[PDB]
Design a protein around this ligand. Structure first.
Ligand code: FUL
Ligand code: FUL
Ligand code: FUL
Ligand code: FUL
Ligand code: FUL
Ligand code: FUL
Ligand code: FUL
Ligand code: FUL
Ligand code: FUL
Ligand code: CA
Ligand code: CA
Ligand code: CA
Ligand code: CA
Ligand code: CA
Ligand code: CA
Ligand code: CA
Ligand code: CA
Ligand code: CA
Ligand code: CA
Lengths: 103, 103, 103, 103, 103
């Protein structure tokens, strides 16, 4: 069980930590078919997706995907500092696996 | 994969982008039978719905319909600037497909 | 498809609009068996229920009834102005069909 | 159908109204197996539970018990004044049936 | 039935109270496969998880795990002072069974 986002990120292939230390600049969400996704940007231009859920996801996985989009929305609206994102960087835009907030 | 709401909107037939750059003037929801919908308006007069959940929306989509109303509700109550809406324009009032916020 | 709460309200029998243009004065909620409901009041005395889910309600209404109670809770705690309610006025208290917020 | 917490409470055996007119002093929450419950206190000394969902609870109450723990959490975090609680006084600590907020 | 986090904690094996009396320093959440978890840290260095939900959890447990992550997120973003945690201390990092807030 990892104790921090970096270690967690390290357990997957084709991941990377972005250290933003900045609030979210823009928040985009879509309910359109095959594109039920969220997209966030930062003032420096970095863009990240929360990928659409699939049939391959069990309920508790689907609740994590939804939770993440919830977290992103509420972080945006409270202007919470995003410390780090763990992303998958073999996708475009980079696909969020995890988030950390601090300060 | 889209990196913003305009790219995403352009993937669908019978969609257009509206540019608001304004907070929601009014938020309406109903639990009346076959009208379980949200409706928002902008001071400029524009009116939009979130559609009644129905048989065209698979599970990810019914979830995202529920998330859209959660978003519109919290956006209204925080006076968050709505940047753009992607809508189906083959409905009256136009039906929301995606939202971007970026005050 | 209706563009506002008045037009939506006009599609049902035994409904009427109340124009309140006021914040909620009190919010009450219950988990007692067969009284799983909320009740709101306004400073003018007007008193409203979200009904206990029962045999009068179709399936599609059940998520919406839960959503309406969430909306009333957060409206109360944000002191949000309630513009209008659509109610069934053959019930005591009057039973909420829809709500519009504007300010 | 009751119009207020007191008349709702009066419909049940082994209940009483507490009149608090105070914010919640503490909020406690457990996920521990067979103690999935919330406990709140007021500065006066008063301790109340939301009961572990159990045999005494009918279907409709399960959702409402979830909502009630939601409401007590956000009441605490918003320093919302609690007016009254309806409780079962044959439980220790006394078990919450209903809550009212005014201020 | 316990009246407080300390009494509830003492009912289980392999548990302990941590007394933090401090707001959450960092909040980390993951949507990644088999790492659907939150992790929080305090300034004194203490690091805690909410367990990954899985086939070994009953629904009551699964529900109470999603609630705990809701609680930790909003407690973080409101800078709510955490009084105590009841945790299982045979896990790394220690796994939250219960949280108390007073302040
Ligand atoms: C961090 C980078 O931000 C850019 O906006 C994206 O186009 C890249 O794919 C990547 O996500
Ligand atoms: C943007 C437009 O706003 C108007 O109020 C509506 O009546 C139209 O149907 C469309 O949705
Ligand atoms: C009967 C009432 O007349 C008023 O003009 C309207 O504003 C209300 O919505 C309602 O329709
Ligand atoms: C209202 C009373 O508060 C006290 O703290 C509790 O110990 C009693 O059981 C009862 O719930
Ligand atoms: C309370 C302790 O915090 C430390 O940071 C962790 O490394 C330990 O495993 C334990 O959870
Ligand atoms: C949890 O922690 C991570 C970093 C891996 O070491 C796993 O083996 C462990 O279960
Ligand atoms: C994904 O996004 C859409 C909008 C198209 O440009 C695709 O080619 C891209 O892969
Ligand atoms: C949908 O809305 C209702 C209120 C009626 O005006 C219909 O004509 C419309 O199609
Ligand atoms: C609903 O309210 C309760 C309190 C009773 O008085 C019933 O008559 C009524 O239908
Ligand atoms: Ca600002
Ligand atoms: Ca802060
Ligand atoms: Ca304003
Ligand atoms: Ca802002
Ligand atoms: Ca005020
Ligand atoms: Ca306002
Ligand atoms: Ca205070
Ligand atoms: Ca107030
Ligand atoms: Ca601060
Ligand atoms: Ca405080």
């Amino acid at each position: 069980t990892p104790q921090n986002i970096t270690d967690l990120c390290a357990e997957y292939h084709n991941t990377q930590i972005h250290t933003l230390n900045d609030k979210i600049f823009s928040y985009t969400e879509s309910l359109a078919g095959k594109r039920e996704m969220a997209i966030i940007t930062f003032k420096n231009g970095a863009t990240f997706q929360v990928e659409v859920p699939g049939s391959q996801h069990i309920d508790s996985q689907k609740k994590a995907i939804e939770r993440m989009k919830d977290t992103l929305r509420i972080a945006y609206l409270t202007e919470a500092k995003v410390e780090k994102l763990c992303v998958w960087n073999n996708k475009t835009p980079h696909a969020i696996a995890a988030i950390s907030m601090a300060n």
